C-alpha cells in the first residue's frame, strides 16, 4: 500500500557514501527507512509526499513538535546575528538562569552539544571530584555512546558486564550494573565497590527496560548509599526530564547531586546540559586558577541552541505540561483498551506525555514479541502514524484531542492487521 | 581605555548559575571575558557596542565569517522545515556526497554533533575493527574531552602520560604518546606496543605544539608502521582540514585510513564527521544485521547542520581557498616584520589561512612568554582585533586586503604597547 520510491532512491545514493546508507543507528529500518522532507506542528511529510502524525518526535526531543512558529522566529533571529562565537553571549546567561530555575538542585549549569557529551562530562566530573574510578549504572539503561556508559545498554537486565566490541577491559572493568527497582540486589553490588565508586548513574524513567518509574524505596536506598559512601548520585534525565515540570527526580520525590539534561530542553537544536549542586560543579570552575576538569567544545552555549532553549522553556509552561500529560493519559488508556479487545497482554507504560507499548508475547505468525511490535510499527506507518519500532511514543504541545483520536483509530486498525496477517 | 561594563554585568549574573560563570573553558579570560552580541562578515560587535575584526572566528570554525548571507538563507530555510527528525532526510545524502567528494579516502562518512564526538567514534571504530586496546597520539596535541584522548593534550612535548584528575588508570594505561616529527623516537614507542595498538591518532598540523606541519619523513614512518602492524591511521583534521582543498593529509602528500572533521565543514552549526575507507567504516553498517559499533545521537545528520554544511562547502571553492591562503601568507609576513622591528624572536607559523604567533621569550616586565602573549591578546582587543590568547588566528572568506592591512597596523601598535608597558 505504501509508496516509498523516493525514499528508496535516496537510500541507493546513501549506501555509496555512508556505511549501510546510515548516519544514526536508531533511525535505520530494514531494508531502508522512510526519509522525510519537512514537518509542521504535529505532522511530518515524507519524501514521497505522505503526511503523517508524529508520535515519536525525534526520539522524544520535539516537545513542541515541528517548526513551532515561536521557536522558528527565535532560532532564525539568532542565526541572523551569528551562529557561534569564540566569546560568551547574553543568551547563554539568560538560558542558564531559565534552566536553573526549574529545580532547586540545578544550582550551576554547563552546556554541551549533546546529551551524549553531557553524560560523559557528568561522569568525568564525578571522577574528578571523588578521585575514584568506578561507576555503577542500571542494567539495561542507555546513556549514549561514551565508552564508560555503553555497557549493558540495550534493555537486558543481565547483571554481568557486556560491552561493545573493542571497548577495552580497562574501561569495562570500571563500570558495574545494578538491577532497576531492586534495592536489596542493588545494595549488594554497590557495597562490594563502595570504596572505589565515583558515582551511581541512573535514569529515573528508563524506556529501554520498560518505561516504568524508579520506586521510592529504590531511590531512597541509592540516595542513602551515596550519602554514606561519598559516591555522586547522577540522574540522566536527557529523555525522562519531561515527565515532571521540575524534572523526573523531583516528580518521584528525590534529589540528584548532578542531573544530565538534553532533548526537550531545546526541543530540536543540538544541546546537552550538566546541572548540579555547586560543590560538584566546582571541578569545572576556571575563575580561581586552572580548573580540575577542563571542558570546552566549539558549539557549547552557542546562541542558536541557547535561543532554541529559551523559547522551548518559555513555551513549556505548567499549563502546557498538564495538558500534554492529560493527552498522554488518554492515549495510554485507549491503547490498553485496544490491546485488551484484540486479546493481547502487552503492557502500556509511561508517565505524563511519554508512553511505551511493551510487547511481551509473540502472536501467531511472529517469531518473537519484538518482531510483532516491528510489524505494528510498519502498519502504523501505513495508517498515518509514526511511533518507535519497539513501541516508544510521546505527545507534543501542538497536539490536541483530534490527534489522539486519530491515533486511537489507527492503533486499533493496525493491531487488527498485524494479527490477521500473522494468522493468514 | 576599553569599556567592558555590560560584559561585567553579564558575568555577575553568570557566576550565580554557571561554575565560575563559564560554560566552555577555552573562551574564559580573567577576570572575565568580553561578551559579544552579534557578528557580520569579518566583524564582531561586543555587548558594549564595540565592533572589532575577528581573526579567530570561533576557534577557526567560521571559515565564512559571521552570518554570511548565503549560509543564513540556507540555515533559516532548513529551520523553517524542521530542525531535527527521527528519520533521515534528503540533505544528509546531499551533504555526504559533497563531503565525500573532497578526498579520495573519504569513501564512507557518518555525522556527529561535534568534533569531540567524532574523534571518540573514530577511536571506537578502530578498537572495534582491530579488537586491540591501545591508542597512540602525539605528545601535546588536543582532540577534545573524550577520556582516551584527553591525555598529554596541553601543548607539552613530555613523553610520560599525564591526564586529567580522575581519569582512571584503566583509561590512561591504554593511551601512549609519540614525539611530533621525530620518526626515530616515534617508532621506538610504537614498536613497543605494536601488537596491542588499535590506532595511531595524529593531527597533521596541531596548533597547540606550534602549528607546524607534519613532515614527509614522519608521515611516511607512521603510514608504514600502520601498514605493517595493522593499526588504523586516524587523521584528526577537525582544526587542520582547512589548510588544503582536499584536507591536510593530502596537502602533505599522505593518506589516512580514517579522517575526523568538523569546524569549517559546516562553518558555524554543530557538526563532526568520521570519513574513511569502506572497510574501516563497516563497523557502523547496520544493513546486514546488528552493527559491530552502534552509533546514534539525537542531532546526527540533522538538516540544519547538513544545510549549513552544504552551503559552507559550496562557498569553499578552489578560488576562495587560494584567496584566503594569499591573505594568510600576507598576514604572517607582516607579523614577522613587526616582531623583527620590535626586537622579538617569536615565531609566526601556519599554512594557508591559519597562523599562530608562538611567543618563546619573556620581554622585560613579563614573568613568562605566555604572559607576554596574553598581554598582546588584550592590547589587540583594545586596538580592535580578536585573536587567541596564545597567538592563534585565521582568515575568513569575507576578509580582503583592508582587513589584513588594519590587522598589521594594530599588531605593530599593540606590540609596541606591550613592550613599553613592560619596561615602564
Ligand atoms: C537521548 C539520551 C542520551 C543521549 O543524548 P543525545 O543528545 O542523543 O546525544 C543520553 N541519555 C539518555 C537517557 C537519553 O535519553
Ligand atoms: C576543535 C577540535 C576538536 C573538537 O571539536 P569540537 O567540535 O569543538 O568538539 C577535536 N580535534 C581537534 C584537532 C580540534 O581542532
Numbering used by the authors:
A (entry chain A), B (entry chain A): 0 to 423
Mind quoting what the paper says about this structure?
As part of investigations into the C-nucleoside formycin A (8-aza-9-deazaadenosine) biosynthetic gene cluster from Streptomyces kaniharaensis, we have characterised a pyridoxal 5′-phosphate (PLP) dependent aminotransferase (ForI) that aminates a pathway intermediate. ForI is a PLP-dependent enzyme from the biosynthetic pathway of the C-nucleoside antibiotic formycin. ForI possesses the mixed β-sheet and three-stranded antiparallel β-sheet insertion characteristic of the PLP dependent aspartic aminotransferase family. The predicted active site of ForI comprises residues from two monomers, indicating the dimer to be the functional unit.
